[PDB]
Amino acid sequence: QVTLKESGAEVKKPGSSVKVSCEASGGTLSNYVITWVRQAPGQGLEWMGGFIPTFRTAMYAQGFQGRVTITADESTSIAYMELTNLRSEDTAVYYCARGPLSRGYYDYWGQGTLVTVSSASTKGPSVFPLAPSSGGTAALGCLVKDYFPEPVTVSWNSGALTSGVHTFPAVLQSSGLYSLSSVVTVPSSSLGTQTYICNVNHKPSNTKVDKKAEP
Amino acid sequence: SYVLTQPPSVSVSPGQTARITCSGDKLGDKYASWYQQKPGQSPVLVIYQDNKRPSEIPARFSGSNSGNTATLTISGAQAMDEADYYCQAWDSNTGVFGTGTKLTVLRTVAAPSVFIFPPSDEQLKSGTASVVCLLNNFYPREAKVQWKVDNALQSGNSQESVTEQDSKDSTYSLSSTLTLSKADYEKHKVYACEVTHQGLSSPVTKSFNRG
Amino acid sequence: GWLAGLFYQHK
Incomplete structure (x- = not known):
């Protein structure tokens, strides 16, 4: 094609x-x-x-x-x-x-x-981990807060992890800045045997953040 | 101005027939085209010249155009067919796209899996606290998330976002964020996310105690 | 004009 x-x-x-x-x-x-x-x-x-x-x-x-x-x-x-x-x-x-x-x-x-x-001014996001404080399944994630403009790309383990991934549409905050979350559901047992890193890239501000989500 | 009217939403049970209409004034006299657009993807040509199909398009996709209406027919609808569909015809030397229809492919009711995430230490050092509630893999889309801080119903301090239907399992996921100042956050103990959905006999509460 | 014909098919 x-x-x-x-x-x-x-x-x-x-x-x-x-x-x-x-x-x-x-x-x-x-x-x-x-x-x-x-x-x-x-x-x-x-x-x-x-x-x-x-x-x-x-x-x-x-x-x-x-x-x-x-x-x-x-x-x-x-x-x-x-x-x-x-x-x-x-x-x-x-x-x-x-x-x-x-x-x-x-x-x-x-x-x-x-x-x-x-x-409005270009602004890179602040990346925070979402870790639990659940039975057989746990959720981990990354909160990509206060960025402008759209878009922001999020990957897990440099793109190797794709299954169970949900990257939510960005929400416009009252400040006029964007906020987004990206989650992955994993087996609860894996939280102690495996590494989960969310990779965030915001091309307009040339920002690249890798963040580990640990419980 | 020429307007091509399409129903905003169409639902199909798996295996059944989806019919998406496009209504226009002299439509039968024009060659109609149809485009499929999946969430976050480019449009794909599915039908051209009212009923012709491109090579890569399954035979279950068909078109027809008569009088004031063109129709896109999807026989044996599958989860694979979840997308926005746009009709397209020419009028007064201009390409005109229709209003667009979101095609929802039904599945069995699935109650959400509920998770609550306290704010990170790194964020508390910044001056704000974002509490996140995740509702994972549910069907249908209709769900209510109620934030409760020390048994007190919150209002105006939360925002939510819903994914489009999943390409394989046909479910939705929802994320809701409760934003508080570090000062208001530290004045309270119990942070709770209360969830209502068709698949839940009783409301599901997920909570944590600050500290 | 006649150029419009290169952009679409008249039925």
């Missing part, structure tokens, strides 16, 4: 401009339609526009016209989207997608880029 790789998550000030890249790896963007679609958190998909690199013609949603620009570089097989005059309502996951010419469907999508539009 053609893989569409998009640039990293970003925080942008209102009134500014954002540029998202979409690299086609193992395929081409020539003789195809490259389209940008966005999704605000907990909301639906919204079509922004399309571009045909070969015919050098774009078509933008009437509501994005004059504020969005879709471009492509032939030698690199990379598409770009530029959204100017950013507003709080522009906070969304931006997806790039490829589809056939004269066919308005999209068979290949990128992973998406979260673009947060805020005046």
Whole structure:
């Protein structure tokens, strides 16, 4: 399958401009339609526009016209989207997608880029262990508190531990900072024979924290 | 503006048939597309040109478009099919996605496993105390978490978060955090999380004594 | 115009 790789998550000030890249790896963007679609958190998909690199013609949603620009570089097989005059309502996951010419469907999508539009300062999380003070099963976890913006990625034992893992959606605190928890259920007997380390990465503040959850 | 209306939620018992509708004005005259989006993942094309299926899509997925309605049909629905589904058609030279439907795949009632976590020493040194209650692997989604500090019902000092249905077992998990200042935290002994759910004959209380 | 046709299929 053609893989569409998009640039990293970003925080942008209102009134500014954002540029998202979409690299086609193992395929081409020539003789195809490259389209940008966005999704605000907990909301639906919204079509922004399309571009045909070969015919050098774009078509933008009437509501994005004059504020969005879709471009492509032939030698690199990379598409770009530029959204100017950013507003709080522009906070969304931006997806790039490829589809056939004269066919308005999209068979290949990128992973998406979260673009947060805020005046607020970037802040790395404080990571605290959640350990019990339960029968055959115990729960351990990590409390990822007071961070901004989203996202935060959490893994257990550098990604080796995946089964029994629940990473909860972040909650917005009254302070305007995000808080999240990540839990793992394990056998009670394992709390004395095994190590459980939660790895937290917050790319916007370039923070990386490894925390052991012990009872 | 063109609006493509979809029901916000659709439920299916395993093995049964899910029908997700998309309602639009001249819909039958347009080619409809359908996308599947699992929690935290990119959309996947499931149907194009009203009823065509991409190579990687099981034959249990089918489409139809007539008059003012397109329908996505999922025969023998499985836990694997839990996702948000979006219809898509063109109008006035613009790609229009439908309202979106969350498809819930039913399972048997599962009571939650309840766990309470006291605040870490590291957090108490910061000035705040977060007490965490976990409700793990329950079904259905409806559950009530009641915080009690020294038998006193708490209000306005907690926030909760629920996961989407699990891809294999079709359950939910819930996390609730009670935030207090270190000073208010040290004025009390008993910290309790009281849980109500369909699968519980009586409320389940998980507690600890500070210290 | 006629370019819109490269973006989707008319039924």
